Design a binder for this molecule. Sequence first.
Ligand SMILES: CCS(=O)(=O)NCc1ccc2c(c1)OCO2
Ligand SMILES: [Cl-]
Ligand SMILES: [Cl-]
Ligand SMILES: [Cl-]
Ligand SMILES: [Cl-]
Ligand SMILES: [Cl-]
Ligand SMILES: [Mg+2]
Length: 348
Amino acid sequence: RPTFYRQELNKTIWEVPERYQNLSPVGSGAYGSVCAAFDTKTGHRVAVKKLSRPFQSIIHAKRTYRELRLLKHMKHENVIGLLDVFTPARSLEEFNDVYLVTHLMGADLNNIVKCQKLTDDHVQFLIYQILRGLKYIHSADIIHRDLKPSNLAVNEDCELKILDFGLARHTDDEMTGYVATRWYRAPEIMLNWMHYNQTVDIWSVGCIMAELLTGRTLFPGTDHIDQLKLILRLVGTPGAELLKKISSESARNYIQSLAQMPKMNFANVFIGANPLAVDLLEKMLVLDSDKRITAAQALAHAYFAQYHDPDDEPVADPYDQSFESRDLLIDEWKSLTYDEVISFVPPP
Ligand SMILES: CCS(=O)(=O)NCc1ccc2c(c1)OCO2
Ligand SMILES: [Cl-]
Ligand SMILES: [Cl-]
Ligand SMILES: [Cl-]
Ligand SMILES: [Cl-]
Ligand SMILES: [Cl-]
Ligand SMILES: [Mg+2]
């Protein structure tokens, strides 16, 4: 067991191992509080997150367990991983606080698409890395659910990591109106058309790639219905085959109320873009999620010929998510989480 020291930072007690020095507040959401620190064991600048009220309800205790299982599993160059997890508790009986440690992220994709000139070579390398990370995530039957520029960390050498997995967190208020939180979402999940799957993340990659090529948001809708009209004007209205797959009768009735529109010519929308970029966008931005290109298929597309290496695009170890259908008490979820904290083995 390491030695811990205590300090109060912005009205919050932090109790951490001595290896973590020079802590300074960097933000606080409803998920918890975050400090920057120097890790004397590794020599890295790190983010330390102290979870807020991790075991306050069955819902919160299960969310804490889900987040810790997912972070312990992800071991890939293009995905956020766990450097450390700790509690100051010496037994299950006194266990209340959880702290997560990751590499400290600098810029996101928002702070390079807004303020930089990107070559086609930059767009190839950035989208290649997102798809390399997604092939790995999808191989474990994990859906990200919230890919957008603020969830992509990028360094001076244009190297990218995926972070901030959707842990079923987002509220109705957060998805209402003129908001970036909804602009990257697939139409089948934005309007609850059907049981969604991993294809929703490929729609999001389409919206991100378009914005890197033009410097503008592809579908900046003022509400759910405005955004659907922007989507259908580009990709066309649905045919009978997709309409049969929409499970809501009322959603089917609303779609049928709209005048029929054909798919637009994407070379006349993405003026001057690499023809291979245009071709890949037409394969991602497909309304019927059964017919979208997969991450594994997209890595083999001629747009990425410069970067593609089929011997260096790894898949994940098997991931057991059977806990998701399990009905447990607060203290049972808390005991499972305790065991995951004490069994953690740091990376090399
Ligand atoms: C695994 C679900 S997640 O990707 O949403 N976790 C977010 C997170 C945010 C800040 C952090 C952190 C973890 O550890 C230190 O600072
Ligand atoms: Cl220590
Ligand atoms: Cl990492
Ligand atoms: Cl504790
Ligand atoms: Cl964003
Ligand atoms: Cl597993
Ligand atoms: Mg985020």
